[PDB]
Amino acid sequence: TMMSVLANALRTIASAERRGKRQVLIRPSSKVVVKFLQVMQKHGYIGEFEIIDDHRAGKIVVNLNGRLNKCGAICPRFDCATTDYEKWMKNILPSRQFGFVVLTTSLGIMDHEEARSRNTGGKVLGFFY
Amino acid sequence: GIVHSTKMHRTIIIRRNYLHFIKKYQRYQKRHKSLAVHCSPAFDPKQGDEVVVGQCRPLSKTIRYNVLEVVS
Amino acid sequence: TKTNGQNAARKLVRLRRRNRWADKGWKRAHTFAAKKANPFGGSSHAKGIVLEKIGVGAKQPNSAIRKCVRVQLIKNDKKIIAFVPNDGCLHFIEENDEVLVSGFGRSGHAVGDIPGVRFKIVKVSSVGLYALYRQKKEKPRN
Amino acid sequence: DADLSYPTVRTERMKHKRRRLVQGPNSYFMDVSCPRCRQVTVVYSHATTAVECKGCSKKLCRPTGGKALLVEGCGYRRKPDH
Amino acid sequence: VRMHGNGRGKASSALPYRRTPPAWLKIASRNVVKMVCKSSRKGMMPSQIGMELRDSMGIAQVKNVTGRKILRILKHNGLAPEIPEDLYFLVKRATQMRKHLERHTTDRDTKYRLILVESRIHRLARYYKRVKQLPPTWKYE
RNA sequence: UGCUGUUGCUGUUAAAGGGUUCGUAGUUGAACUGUGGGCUGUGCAGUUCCUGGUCCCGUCCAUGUCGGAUUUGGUGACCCAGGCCCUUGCAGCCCGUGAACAUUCAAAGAAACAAGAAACACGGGAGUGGUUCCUGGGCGUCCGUGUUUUACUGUGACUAAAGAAGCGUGACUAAAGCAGUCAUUUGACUUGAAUUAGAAAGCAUGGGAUAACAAAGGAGCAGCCUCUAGGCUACCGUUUCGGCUUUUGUUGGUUUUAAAGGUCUAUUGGAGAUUAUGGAGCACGGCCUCUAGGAAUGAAGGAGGGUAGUUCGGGGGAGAACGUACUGGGGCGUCAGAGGUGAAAUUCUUAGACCGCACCAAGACGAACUACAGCGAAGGCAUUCUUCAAGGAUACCUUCCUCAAUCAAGAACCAAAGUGUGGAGAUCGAAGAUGAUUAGAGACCAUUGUAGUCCACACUGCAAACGAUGACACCCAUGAAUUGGGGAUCUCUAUUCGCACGGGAAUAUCCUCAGCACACGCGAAAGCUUUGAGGUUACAGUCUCAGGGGGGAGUA
């Protein structure tokens, strides 16, 4: 019973970053798991993927460069109006400098900083410091 | 709304389903309201059909609405 | 553990209504069971008549005889053993004197070393009791 | 030393078929030739059924649980995958 | 995990990535489609039809040769069974256990294994009505 | 007061996981339809040509096997390099694309066409548009004829003052107030009195990632378009006579012709997402035939189902037996004690106990093998043979295609003792009796003994029902083991046994799935660990149950 396929995905990345692994192999890839990872990769927290075809649901193989402290998923996916970036910045991120909160917006999966500038709000997905 | 039950003569009960938002817990809730709605014999809705429903003057005791359209 | 979901807000609202009753500082605020039994009936002070002067042997390792009074509340007709707060002040109280009674200050329970005494006298015949003890006013003769 | 995305021969020869990176089959078709008549029938590795020659009906294999036993020196030829 | 009872065991066919039929199959689609139906007129189910093809006749997957699964092939020819076969083999177990328990009324183990099997039937019969593949008045008895 | 916990608690031992399983309302629910391109200038990263600083080749030695050097060495290897728009990717910018593919090319994609489009095309109105708008085409208006919402988010409308936030302002300051300030008089400031928030719901309109609703369930279907010619043909309406399109000057009446549509035949051009010159039947061919059928995402280290080893097991029901033992009874012998205890005594004995052989009768029970073993949802389950339905695990390129997870209410099962009616009654044995012990002692000990213990059919549902640890899912290192099933050896290949339940059985090496068990991190500590109490203030995978100082009390 895989309820959220990000929950399973970003834990593995999280809990295999805490062990210093060079690579992680993630069980059910999905359109959201990729778009989330490609945001991690934009800011330098992950090296590379392989998305392997099983013909059913892929298997992502991520190269870790050692720079992730944590990866969450926020499970119920609460909303954000663009005025609510300050709650999430405040509660879930360590400092007001270096964290990132990842959202789904009309425009897509993007950072809370890519969202403030485009003015969309959306639903929260997770974070990474 | 959906057509809940047809058993009245020339009238019908629609249930209108909605989610209600409780602030403290930041989550939703199933709720519903049911209406007495008059169906002109032009229409023949069956249980389960979405229906468009208009405002009327009070007709029976509980009937303020009237079936405009049957969507199926 | 608890239940989590966007649409789950019944379970959460219900689950708190049920689990607050397990709370006591308020299993107190919600029971008339509290009000019927507080001989003041909810009010901060009350006036009684002095029925009887009473020594109460102090509790546990402390030895003393604490100077207490029975009281007949004028509201409720209930009877209350109240404490006379200071030196010799039981001399300012006579039987059948009207007396204003207050709590000890742990709301419904006795202040340690007087067994089961929840109330103390603040006034005797409309003159304050500490204002008589400390000498300020003279007890009106009537 | 190892990549997860390109594993060595020795690691993945060991794994369960479902635990492979791929999910492959463990089975293959053999090309079987009946001893009693010279005739050739394709036979599935794990048969799970009585399999008979077409001309003569010989019961060319046993159902046995894991991997079917071919009968009495009948010639097997293993077919390709593709 | 498992529907009723606790096993976690995992054993399944693992279908290949490569879906083109082998080179050594010289059997035309219409010759497969006719085998299916020919052997379904012998009163067979699909879950077996597909065996006699991979066992003896060497057709691994009928979708991969014939364009289509073993039931569209039957549903198109009107040979499709009246009750889905996952539902037929449960009713068939439940009834034998009902016949078992009719002599043996102290056998508690199979009185509990019914309670499971019947509760399945009512879940499938709830699926196959919702999905419209059973008549909405279908009932156990 | 994170002691009510959505943010945000706790539940092995502190208070707290229901005894187990099924299961409705409810909550939660897997993947997929989807990197748009090319051109220019400019920032990044990964084959022309030039190096000779390497290893390889070779030479000289030959050195028994750990020297070496040797030049050209050698398009070999290699390298550090270049404003090569030859490279590819990539950042940023300009800008073009009917822009995948196909299709058109006329004055600049016009027309047809492809795609989209109801915010649309298709016909129509002068009582449309400030006197019928613009330059044969085009907008505006109205009507007739022929398919998407919602949450969420952005913006915007719509909303009493006081109150709260806020701008301005020296009421002497301040709590306030909405005032005042300035010339210089016989007014000036266009005098100020801004602005914001204000659950939910309702309104309009952008966005379309994540989600929800509805529909589907795949043979439960399904339209090829187009030029022209001909033929026939009212059109609606019905209860009886009803309706009817302009033009002919107008109205009433009649009637024709004509288009329209329909329908029948005729072939003009082109399609087609599934081969008709094809399949089928009687290597080529006819003949005769019968004539739609293949266009569907996938098959989840999710669920259900199938078949196989006549696989695995103290799993469950039934029927026959079997085994020694406790007790009892005769038979057969013997003669004085036996039993029981710390020591005795109550109890049994010349009317023959104890003891010893062989049996017979009855009821229970399944020792040793028996384990940190197996099976079962838990409770529980141990002789053999037959027998009846099942159950898991494994094997598989079978089948199916979301059917699922957890669960108020509800249902079934639940050890021992109990309870009801019949049976049984060997052993043990609540109550009871007796002897000891003791200051006392029905107690603990001993000889007894009723209910009971056993069985069938009904109830009860009250355990330290324990792992004091809810269920489903994921991640997680090590060593030797173990029970099922499977695979390889027939770099590991090897041992022992030899028609008949047997091309067999067990073992060895290695792998693998599934079961019970004997580094991180966490924890108040004890300790837990791929069988979690770990991956949690860096707090969020899902459902549910219970706890909130000790008593009173699981009482009234």
PDB file of N, CA, C and O in Angstrom, chain B residues 18-69:
ATOM      1  N   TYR B  18     -20.992  18.955  -0.616  1.00  0.00           N
ATOM      2  CA  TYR B  18     -19.936  19.945  -0.592  1.00  0.00           C
ATOM      3  C   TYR B  18     -18.952  19.576   0.502  1.00  0.00           C
ATOM      4  O   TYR B  18     -19.226  18.728   1.345  1.00  0.00           O
ATOM      5  N   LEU B  19     -17.776  20.176   0.448  1.00  0.00           N
ATOM      6  CA  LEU B  19     -16.765  20.019   1.476  1.00  0.00           C
ATOM      7  C   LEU B  19     -16.691  21.301   2.276  1.00  0.00           C
ATOM      8  O   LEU B  19     -16.685  22.387   1.698  1.00  0.00           O
ATOM      9  N   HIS B  20     -16.616  21.182   3.588  1.00  0.00           N
ATOM     10  CA  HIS B  20     -16.575  22.335   4.468  1.00  0.00           C
ATOM     11  C   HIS B  20     -15.234  22.379   5.168  1.00  0.00           C
ATOM     12  O   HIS B  20     -14.694  21.337   5.530  1.00  0.00           O
ATOM     13  N   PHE B  21     -14.714  23.577   5.378  1.00  0.00           N
ATOM     14  CA  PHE B  21     -13.335  23.780   5.786  1.00  0.00           C
ATOM     15  C   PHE B  21     -13.277  24.230   7.230  1.00  0.00           C
ATOM     16  O   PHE B  21     -13.750  25.318   7.554  1.00  0.00           O
ATOM     17  N   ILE B  22     -12.657  23.427   8.085  1.00  0.00           N
ATOM     18  CA  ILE B  22     -12.536  23.756   9.499  1.00  0.00           C
ATOM     19  C   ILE B  22     -11.175  24.373   9.765  1.00  0.00           C
ATOM     20  O   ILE B  22     -10.142  23.738   9.563  1.00  0.00           O
ATOM     21  N   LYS B  23     -11.178  25.610  10.246  1.00  0.00           N
ATOM     22  CA  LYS B  23      -9.964  26.414  10.252  1.00  0.00           C
ATOM     23  C   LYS B  23      -8.925  25.832  11.185  1.00  0.00           C
ATOM     24  O   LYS B  23      -7.753  25.721  10.829  1.00  0.00           O
ATOM     25  N   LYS B  24      -9.329  25.491  12.399  1.00  0.00           N
ATOM     26  CA  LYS B  24      -8.370  25.024  13.386  1.00  0.00           C
ATOM     27  C   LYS B  24      -7.563  23.864  12.852  1.00  0.00           C
ATOM     28  O   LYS B  24      -6.341  23.855  12.956  1.00  0.00           O
ATOM     29  N   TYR B  25      -8.222  22.891  12.254  1.00  0.00           N
ATOM     30  CA  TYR B  25      -7.535  21.712  11.783  1.00  0.00           C
ATOM     31  C   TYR B  25      -7.058  21.815  10.353  1.00  0.00           C
ATOM     32  O   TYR B  25      -6.328  20.939   9.907  1.00  0.00           O
ATOM     33  N   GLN B  26      -7.449  22.847   9.626  1.00  0.00           N
ATOM     34  CA  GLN B  26      -6.955  23.085   8.277  1.00  0.00           C
ATOM     35  C   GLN B  26      -7.307  21.969   7.311  1.00  0.00           C
ATOM     36  O   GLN B  26      -6.554  21.688   6.384  1.00  0.00           O
ATOM     37  N   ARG B  27      -8.444  21.322   7.497  1.00  0.00           N
ATOM     38  CA  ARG B  27      -8.825  20.183   6.686  1.00  0.00           C
ATOM     39  C   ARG B  27     -10.276  20.331   6.273  1.00  0.00           C
ATOM     40  O   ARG B  27     -10.925  21.313   6.626  1.00  0.00           O
ATOM     41  N   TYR B  28     -10.793  19.351   5.549  1.00  0.00           N
ATOM     42  CA  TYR B  28     -12.162  19.433   5.070  1.00  0.00           C
ATOM     43  C   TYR B  28     -13.042  18.360   5.669  1.00  0.00           C
ATOM     44  O   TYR B  28     -12.637  17.610   6.550  1.00  0.00           O
ATOM     45  N   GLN B  29     -14.270  18.319   5.200  1.00  0.00           N
ATOM     46  CA  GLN B  29     -15.311  17.548   5.826  1.00  0.00           C
ATOM     47  C   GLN B  29     -16.307  17.198   4.740  1.00  0.00           C
ATOM     48  O   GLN B  29     -16.575  18.030   3.878  1.00  0.00           O
ATOM     49  N   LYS B  30     -16.876  16.006   4.756  1.00  0.00           N
ATOM     50  CA  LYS B  30     -18.031  15.798   3.897  1.00  0.00           C
ATOM     51  C   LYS B  30     -19.258  16.400   4.537  1.00  0.00           C
ATOM     52  O   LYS B  30     -19.524  16.179   5.714  1.00  0.00           O
ATOM     53  N   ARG B  31     -20.028  17.138   3.755  1.00  0.00           N
ATOM     54  CA  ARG B  31     -21.343  17.558   4.185  1.00  0.00           C
ATOM     55  C   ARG B  31     -22.295  17.443   3.015  1.00  0.00           C
ATOM     56  O   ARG B  31     -21.871  17.221   1.886  1.00  0.00           O
ATOM     57  N   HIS B  32     -23.592  17.554   3.299  1.00  0.00           N
ATOM     58  CA  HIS B  32     -24.624  17.608   2.277  1.00  0.00           C
ATOM     59  C   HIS B  32     -25.822  18.379   2.787  1.00  0.00           C
ATOM     60  O   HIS B  32     -26.038  18.475   3.991  1.00  0.00           O
ATOM     61  N   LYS B  33     -26.616  18.894   1.859  1.00  0.00           N
ATOM     62  CA  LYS B  33     -27.914  19.496   2.132  1.00  0.00           C
ATOM     63  C   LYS B  33     -28.869  18.917   1.110  1.00  0.00           C
ATOM     64  O   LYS B  33     -28.476  18.693  -0.030  1.00  0.00           O
ATOM     65  N   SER B  34     -30.107  18.677   1.493  1.00  0.00           N
ATOM     66  CA  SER B  34     -31.094  18.155   0.562  1.00  0.00           C
ATOM     67  C   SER B  34     -32.212  19.169   0.409  1.00  0.00           C
ATOM     68  O   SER B  34     -32.558  19.855   1.371  1.00  0.00           O
ATOM     69  N   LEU B  35     -32.765  19.266  -0.795  1.00  0.00           N
ATOM     70  CA  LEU B  35     -33.784  20.249  -1.123  1.00  0.00           C
ATOM     71  C   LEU B  35     -35.019  19.545  -1.645  1.00  0.00           C
ATOM     72  O   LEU B  35     -34.917  18.465  -2.218  1.00  0.00           O
ATOM     73  N   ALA B  36     -36.182  20.143  -1.447  1.00  0.00           N
ATOM     74  CA  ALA B  36     -37.351  19.719  -2.199  1.00  0.00           C
ATOM     75  C   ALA B  36     -37.457  20.537  -3.471  1.00  0.00           C
ATOM     76  O   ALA B  36     -37.478  21.765  -3.431  1.00  0.00           O
ATOM     77  N   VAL B  37     -37.488  19.854  -4.607  1.00  0.00           N
ATOM     78  CA  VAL B  37     -37.440  20.493  -5.911  1.00  0.00           C
ATOM     79  C   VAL B  37     -38.561  19.929  -6.753  1.00  0.00           C
ATOM     80  O   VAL B  37     -38.747  18.713  -6.804  1.00  0.00           O
ATOM     81  N   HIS B  38     -39.291  20.800  -7.423  1.00  0.00           N
ATOM     82  CA  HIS B  38     -40.422  20.432  -8.256  1.00  0.00           C
ATOM     83  C   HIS B  38     -39.928  20.057  -9.644  1.00  0.00           C
ATOM     84  O   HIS B  38     -39.176  20.810 -10.255  1.00  0.00           O
ATOM     85  N   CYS B  39     -40.330  18.893 -10.134  1.00  0.00           N
ATOM     86  CA  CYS B  39     -39.994  18.469 -11.485  1.00  0.00           C
ATOM     87  C   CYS B  39     -41.230  18.493 -12.346  1.00  0.00           C
ATOM     88  O   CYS B  39     -42.106  17.647 -12.186  1.00  0.00           O
ATOM     89  N   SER B  40     -41.289  19.439 -13.263  1.00  0.00           N
ATOM     90  CA  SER B  40     -42.355  19.434 -14.235  1.00  0.00           C
ATOM     91  C   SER B  40     -42.378  18.097 -14.959  1.00  0.00           C
ATOM     92  O   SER B  40     -41.339  17.473 -15.167  1.00  0.00           O
ATOM     93  N   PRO B  41     -43.550  17.620 -15.344  1.00  0.00           N
ATOM     94  CA  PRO B  41     -43.604  16.328 -16.018  1.00  0.00           C
ATOM     95  C   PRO B  41     -42.906  16.318 -17.358  1.00  0.00           C
ATOM     96  O   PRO B  41     -42.821  15.251 -17.977  1.00  0.00           O
ATOM     97  N   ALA B  42     -42.497  17.474 -17.880  1.00  0.00           N
ATOM     98  CA  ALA B  42     -41.598  17.488 -19.028  1.00  0.00           C
ATOM     99  C   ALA B  42     -40.379  16.622 -18.774  1.00  0.00           C
ATOM    100  O   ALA B  42     -40.009  15.803 -19.614  1.00  0.00           O
ATOM    101  N   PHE B  43     -39.725  16.799 -17.637  1.00  0.00           N
ATOM    102  CA  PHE B  43     -38.526  16.034 -17.345  1.00  0.00           C
ATOM    103  C   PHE B  43     -38.898  14.681 -16.754  1.00  0.00           C
ATOM    104  O   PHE B  43     -39.989  14.519 -16.207  1.00  0.00           O
ATOM    105  N   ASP B  44     -38.002  13.707 -16.895  1.00  0.00           N
ATOM    106  CA  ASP B  44     -38.121  12.464 -16.153  1.00  0.00           C
ATOM    107  C   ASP B  44     -36.783  12.092 -15.552  1.00  0.00           C
ATOM    108  O   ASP B  44     -36.112  11.194 -16.074  1.00  0.00           O
ATOM    109  N   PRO B  45     -36.356  12.717 -14.509  1.00  0.00           N
ATOM    110  CA  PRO B  45     -35.074  12.349 -13.925  1.00  0.00           C
ATOM    111  C   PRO B  45     -35.180  11.065 -13.134  1.00  0.00           C
ATOM    112  O   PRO B  45     -36.240  10.745 -12.596  1.00  0.00           O
ATOM    113  N   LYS B  46     -34.072  10.348 -13.036  1.00  0.00           N
ATOM    114  CA  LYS B  46     -33.962   9.117 -12.273  1.00  0.00           C
ATOM    115  C   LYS B  46     -32.915   9.335 -11.202  1.00  0.00           C
ATOM    116  O   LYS B  46     -32.104  10.254 -11.305  1.00  0.00           O
ATOM    117  N   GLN B  47     -32.923   8.497 -10.178  1.00  0.00           N
ATOM    118  CA  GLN B  47     -31.924   8.654  -9.137  1.00  0.00           C
ATOM    119  C   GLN B  47     -30.537   8.669  -9.746  1.00  0.00           C
ATOM    120  O   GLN B  47     -30.171   7.781 -10.510  1.00  0.00           O
ATOM    121  N   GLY B  48     -29.771   9.691  -9.417  1.00  0.00           N
ATOM    122  CA  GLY B  48     -28.419   9.783  -9.887  1.00  0.00           C
ATOM    123  C   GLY B  48     -28.151  10.839 -10.927  1.00  0.00           C
ATOM    124  O   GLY B  48     -26.984  11.099 -11.221  1.00  0.00           O
ATOM    125  N   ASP B  49     -29.166  11.457 -11.503  1.00  0.00           N
ATOM    126  CA  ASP B  49     -28.882  12.429 -12.542  1.00  0.00           C
ATOM    127  C   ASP B  49     -28.666  13.805 -11.954  1.00  0.00           C
ATOM    128  O   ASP B  49     -29.424  14.270 -11.117  1.00  0.00           O
ATOM    129  N   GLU B  50     -27.606  14.453 -12.389  1.00  0.00           N
ATOM    130  CA  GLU B  50     -27.357  15.830 -12.017  1.00  0.00           C
ATOM    131  C   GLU B  50     -28.456  16.635 -12.666  1.00  0.00           C
ATOM    132  O   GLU B  50     -28.939  16.265 -13.734  1.00  0.00           O
ATOM    133  N   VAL B  51     -28.855  17.720 -12.025  1.00  0.00           N
ATOM    134  CA  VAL B  51     -30.013  18.502 -12.423  1.00  0.00           C
ATOM    135  C   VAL B  51     -29.700  19.960 -12.156  1.00  0.00           C
ATOM    136  O   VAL B  51     -29.071  20.281 -11.148  1.00  0.00           O
ATOM    137  N   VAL B  52     -30.116  20.840 -13.059  1.00  0.00           N
ATOM    138  CA  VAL B  52     -30.049  22.266 -12.791  1.00  0.00           C
ATOM    139  C   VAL B  52     -31.393  22.723 -12.259  1.00  0.00           C
ATOM    140  O   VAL B  52     -32.439  22.247 -12.699  1.00  0.00           O
ATOM    141  N   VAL B  53     -31.372  23.638 -11.298  1.00  0.00           N
ATOM    142  CA  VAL B  53     -32.497  23.891 -10.406  1.00  0.00           C
ATOM    143  C   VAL B  53     -32.629  25.391 -10.213  1.00  0.00           C
ATOM    144  O   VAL B  53     -31.648  26.051  -9.870  1.00  0.00           O
ATOM    145  N   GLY B  54     -33.812  25.938 -10.444  1.00  0.00           N
ATOM    146  CA  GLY B  54     -34.026  27.378 -10.366  1.00  0.00           C
ATOM    147  C   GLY B  54     -34.806  27.815  -9.143  1.00  0.00           C
ATOM    148  O   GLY B  54     -35.483  27.011  -8.521  1.00  0.00           O
ATOM    149  N   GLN B  55     -34.779  29.112  -8.871  1.00  0.00           N
ATOM    150  CA  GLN B  55     -35.467  29.684  -7.723  1.00  0.00           C
ATOM    151  C   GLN B  55     -36.904  30.019  -8.079  1.00  0.00           C
ATOM    152  O   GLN B  55     -37.177  30.594  -9.128  1.00  0.00           O
ATOM    153  N   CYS B  56     -37.830  29.694  -7.195  1.00  0.00           N
ATOM    154  CA  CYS B  56     -39.229  30.002  -7.419  1.00  0.00           C
ATOM    155  C   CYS B  56     -39.811  30.578  -6.147  1.00  0.00           C
ATOM    156  O   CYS B  56     -39.158  30.622  -5.113  1.00  0.00           O
ATOM    157  N   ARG B  57     -41.030  31.076  -6.244  1.00  0.00           N
ATOM    158  CA  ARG B  57     -41.716  31.463  -5.038  1.00  0.00           C
ATOM    159  C   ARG B  57     -42.128  30.198  -4.302  1.00  0.00           C
ATOM    160  O   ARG B  57     -42.183  29.130  -4.899  1.00  0.00           O
ATOM    161  N   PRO B  58     -42.395  30.272  -3.010  1.00  0.00           N
ATOM    162  CA  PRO B  58     -42.759  29.058  -2.294  1.00  0.00           C
ATOM    163  C   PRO B  58     -44.008  28.411  -2.863  1.00  0.00           C
ATOM    164  O   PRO B  58     -45.036  29.052  -3.036  1.00  0.00           O
ATOM    165  N   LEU B  59     -43.894  27.119  -3.149  1.00  0.00           N
ATOM    166  CA  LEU B  59     -44.893  26.357  -3.886  1.00  0.00           C
ATOM    167  C   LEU B  59     -45.649  25.409  -2.978  1.00  0.00           C
ATOM    168  O   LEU B  59     -46.873  25.423  -2.924  1.00  0.00           O
ATOM    169  N   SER B  60     -44.933  24.472  -2.400  1.00  0.00           N
ATOM    170  CA  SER B  60     -45.406  23.765  -1.231  1.00  0.00           C
ATOM    171  C   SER B  60     -44.778  24.350   0.013  1.00  0.00           C
ATOM    172  O   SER B  60     -44.247  25.451   0.003  1.00  0.00           O
ATOM    173  N   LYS B  61     -44.891  23.626   1.109  1.00  0.00           N
ATOM    174  CA  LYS B  61     -44.242  24.080   2.319  1.00  0.00           C
ATOM    175  C   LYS B  61     -42.741  24.161   2.133  1.00  0.00           C
ATOM    176  O   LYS B  61     -42.126  25.180   2.446  1.00  0.00           O
ATOM    177  N   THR B  62     -42.121  23.088   1.663  1.00  0.00           N
ATOM    178  CA  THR B  62     -40.675  23.026   1.583  1.00  0.00           C
ATOM    179  C   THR B  62     -40.098  23.278   0.198  1.00  0.00           C
ATOM    180  O   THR B  62     -38.886  23.164   0.041  1.00  0.00           O
ATOM    181  N   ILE B  63     -40.902  23.606  -0.807  1.00  0.00           N
ATOM    182  CA  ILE B  63     -40.418  23.685  -2.181  1.00  0.00           C
ATOM    183  C   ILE B  63     -40.211  25.137  -2.565  1.00  0.00           C
ATOM    184  O   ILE B  63     -41.179  25.856  -2.805  1.00  0.00           O
ATOM    185  N   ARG B  64     -38.963  25.591  -2.630  1.00  0.00           N
ATOM    186  CA  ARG B  64     -38.642  26.883  -3.227  1.00  0.00           C
ATOM    187  C   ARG B  64     -37.977  26.780  -4.589  1.00  0.00           C
ATOM    188  O   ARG B  64     -37.684  27.808  -5.187  1.00  0.00           O
ATOM    189  N   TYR B  65     -37.706  25.587  -5.088  1.00  0.00           N
ATOM    190  CA  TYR B  65     -36.928  25.419  -6.304  1.00  0.00           C
ATOM    191  C   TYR B  65     -37.691  24.611  -7.335  1.00  0.00           C
ATOM    192  O   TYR B  65     -38.684  23.956  -7.028  1.00  0.00           O
ATOM    193  N   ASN B  66     -37.212  24.661  -8.572  1.00  0.00           N
ATOM    194  CA  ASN B  66     -37.906  24.041  -9.685  1.00  0.00           C
ATOM    195  C   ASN B  66     -36.885  23.589 -10.719  1.00  0.00           C
ATOM    196  O   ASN B  66     -35.954  24.319 -11.032  1.00  0.00           O
ATOM    197  N   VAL B  67     -37.075  22.398 -11.287  1.00  0.00           N
ATOM    198  CA  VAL B  67     -36.057  21.760 -12.129  1.00  0.00           C
ATOM    199  C   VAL B  67     -36.063  22.416 -13.502  1.00  0.00           C
ATOM    200  O   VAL B  67     -37.055  22.369 -14.219  1.00  0.00           O
ATOM    201  N   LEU B  68     -34.932  23.028 -13.861  1.00  0.00           N
ATOM    202  CA  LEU B  68     -34.760  23.656 -15.165  1.00  0.00           C
ATOM    203  C   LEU B  68     -34.290  22.679 -16.216  1.00  0.00           C
ATOM    204  O   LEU B  68     -34.691  22.772 -17.377  1.00  0.00           O
ATOM    205  N   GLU B  69     -33.362  21.805 -15.857  1.00  0.00           N
ATOM    206  CA  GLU B  69     -32.673  21.000 -16.843  1.00  0.00           C
ATOM    207  C   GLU B  69     -32.180  19.717 -16.206  1.00  0.00           C
ATOM    208  O   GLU B  69     -31.770  19.699 -15.050  1.00  0.00           O
TER     209      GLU B  69
END
